Amino acid sequence: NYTFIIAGGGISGLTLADRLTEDPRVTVLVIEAGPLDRGEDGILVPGAFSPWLYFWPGLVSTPQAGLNNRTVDVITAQVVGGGSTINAMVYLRGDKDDYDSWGALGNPGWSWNSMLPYFIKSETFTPPSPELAAAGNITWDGSIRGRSGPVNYSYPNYFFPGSENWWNAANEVGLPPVKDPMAGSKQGVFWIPSAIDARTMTRSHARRNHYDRVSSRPNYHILPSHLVSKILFRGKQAIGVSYIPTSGGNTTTNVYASKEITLAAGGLGTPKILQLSGIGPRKLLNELGIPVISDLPGVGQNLQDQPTLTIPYTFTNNVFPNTDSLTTNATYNAEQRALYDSSKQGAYTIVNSLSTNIGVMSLQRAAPKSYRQIIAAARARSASLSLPPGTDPAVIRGYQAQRNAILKQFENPNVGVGTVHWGTGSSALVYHLKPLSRGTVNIRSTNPLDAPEIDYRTGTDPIDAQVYTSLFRKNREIFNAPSMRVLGPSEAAPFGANLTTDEEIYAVMRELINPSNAHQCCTAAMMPKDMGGVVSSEQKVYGVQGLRVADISFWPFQLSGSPMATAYAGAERLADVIKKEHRLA
Ligand SMILES: Cc1cc2c(cc1C)N(C[C@H](O)[C@H](O)[C@H](O)COP(=O)(O)OP(=O)(O)OC[C@H]1O[C@@H](n3cnc4c(N)ncnc43)[C@H](O)[C@@H]1O)c1[nH]c(=O)[nH]c(=O)c1N2
Ligand SMILES: *[C@@H]1O[C@H](CO)[C@@H](O[C@@H]2O[C@H](CO)[C@@H](O)[C@H](O)[C@H]2NC(C)=O)[C@H](O)[C@H]1NC(C)=O
Ligand SMILES: *[C@@H]1O[C@H](CO)[C@@H](O)[C@H](O)[C@H]1NC(C)=O
Ligand SMILES: *[C@@H]1O[C@H](CO)[C@@H](O)[C@H](O)[C@H]1NC(C)=O
Ligand SMILES: *[C@@H]1O[C@H](CO)[C@@H](O)[C@H](O)[C@H]1NC(C)=O
Ligand SMILES: *[C@@H]1O[C@H](CO)[C@@H](O)[C@H](O)[C@H]1NC(C)=O
Ligand SMILES: COC(=O)c1ccc(C[NH3+])cc1
Ligand SMILES: [Mg+2]
Ligand code: NA
């Protein structure tokens, strides 16, 4: 038996395992649903991006009430490195108030100031070449970017020429250059920091930078292709776990730990381990005849993602080359693959279908004329309307406090609620960063191979549609600006210039929004128990000893940004909290 068992070898588990195994007297077992990736081009080479090699299979949503009852495929990782292995490598910190908010929901410690040292420790930033910084308008604040930590990030070493048109158009419609989107604000446009190792121009995922890097260590055990099926207890103490093969062979095995269990199975996996282990809402557990160890009705409640919209265009006069050239021009593709293989230059340094720059905006940057009308509607409506009738009152009090903090962010000029992106090809992306809508993930049985019922409940809160429609309109501004007009863009079916009203435009969005960018979070939320929280400030699950949540299940709510950089830094942080309590080197 081992000092610690970690359930899941994604960003959080692997980061924690690495730091705990720094004390050679400490032994760790990481059990991970997925295999080791085979170093295949679709993982390591940006231009080869093929996320679908390591998607969890047979995961489908309920009909989505907010999105014309559409049923969508659920995307999450099943592989050592979890999401970092298969993600678009977008490496962005939240805004200051994201972390200050978490502290103000009743979590001592938590702030931008307490998270800043861990973001720095987490990483090594490699500067781009000076000719690319100057030509690309790449800027950073060296003072707040790590130089010693394991996660490599940098930028591609190429941009598509059209990314210049987009930058100037974004500038032209109120989205200015951001000095460093990693400094706690990101109001305008910047280069996407990418989680790439610039020595090789290859993905820097948790498996390389928090396992291969330290895999010489005897005390750092990994077991790929196995599920944690249950937590094992002596009374209220978690002592070990049962594990089964992922492929569904008739085999169960108990392993035990001397100190703690850490759950790290992500937003769609950690709640399931708790519910099967009898840590969940009493009503769900009773209905299934699971003995109740800890009545926590917040387990599987409060699911959030960051919805996506793909807006199709045609161009009379698009500049060559662009991202779509890699698909349609076999010659261009081969010349750039040859150029990557030889001298590690060119289009293959960029994640396939993305560009190098991006915009983020606050509510009042998106909608300078109407943001007060949106806030008013939000402040008018009671928090309880967002949740099913019958929702536990502690869960409702928690959402109400999230909702209040999010409404202040709506008022804040320096907090993002949306992302705009153009790949330089036939589509643009608009991300809803801060939805007020709340979903569920609940086990349907006691069979640990069974999919949990996943209900995103995207667009159930009608304030989300007003925010999203503002985001859509600002994107349209960029494409209609002078610097993008010379390319002759026009919205393709089922959008178009012929949709002018909030209702015409959102009717289409309703049909097209993806509930998910696989940023599933918050389904075991770090708030007080009397506000429907599952974990304390030190990430300990309520009413049980020696069990914490490390994965982004613990987040109260979605950042102004994508989760990956906080997943790393949060795990770096929990690592110090555990070493503190049990006295390790
Ligand atoms: C395709 C795609 C693309 C993106 C992203 C995700 C995906 C799927 N994301 C999201 C981001 O990668 C994700 O939110 C983080 O990896 C979350 O880290 P965790 O440690 O919470 O989960 P993560 O998913 O990393 O780890 C959970 C692990 O637990 C395992 N598991 C589940 N149940 C288990 C069980 N019972 N037993 C054992 N193991 C179990 C899974 O196999 C998985 O590997 C992203 N973010 C970002 O910042 N930039 C981006 O560009 C993207 N893009
Ligand atoms: C990726 O991250 C690591 C961590 O900073 C870098 O590895 C260090 O590199 C220097 C010079 O190569 C060595 O002398 C150190 O011993 C290495 N490890 C450390 C400080 O932990 C690596 O340089 C980074 N990749 C890039 C492109 O810079
Ligand atoms: C979605 O299905 C439900 C039946 O459960 C029904 O109330 C509703 O009308 C449907 N909505 C749409 C827009 O199809
Ligand atoms: C860089 O910004 C300058 C304005 O400072 C502008 O002239 C140029 O077109 C921009 N190019 C890109 C690639 O963003
Ligand atoms: C697995 O094996 C045990 C004993 O060999 C038995 O209780 C059980 O029915 C088997 N299960 C399946 C699904 O075959
Ligand atoms: C295709 O790409 C090659 C290589 O860069 C280029 O010479 C050619 O002009 C392109 N052809 C078309 C039709 O885009
Ligand atoms: C800016 O691009 C992204 O954040 C992103 C793009 C594509 C995918 C994969 N479906 C995921 C994330
Ligand atoms: Mg240099
Ligand atoms: Na270069």
Residue numbers in the entry: 46 to 630
Could you pull the original sentences from the published paper?
The FAD-dependent oxidoreductase from Chaetomium thermophilum (CtFDO) is a novel thermostable glycoprotein from the glucose–methanol–choline (GMC) oxidoreductase superfamily. However, CtFDO shows no activity toward the typical substrates of the family and high-throughput screening with around 1000 compounds did not yield any strongly reacting substrate. The structure of CtFDO reveals an unusually wide-open solvent-accessible active-site pocket with a unique His–Ser amino-acid pair putatively involved in enzyme catalysis. A series of six crystal structures of CtFDO complexes revealed five different subsites for the binding of aryl moieties inside the active-site pocket and conformational flexibility of the interacting amino acids when adapting to a particular ligand.
One additional water mediates the contact of MAMB with Asn562. MAMB is further stabilized by van der Waals (vdW) interactions with the flavin, Ala133, Leu399, Tyr476 and Asn562.
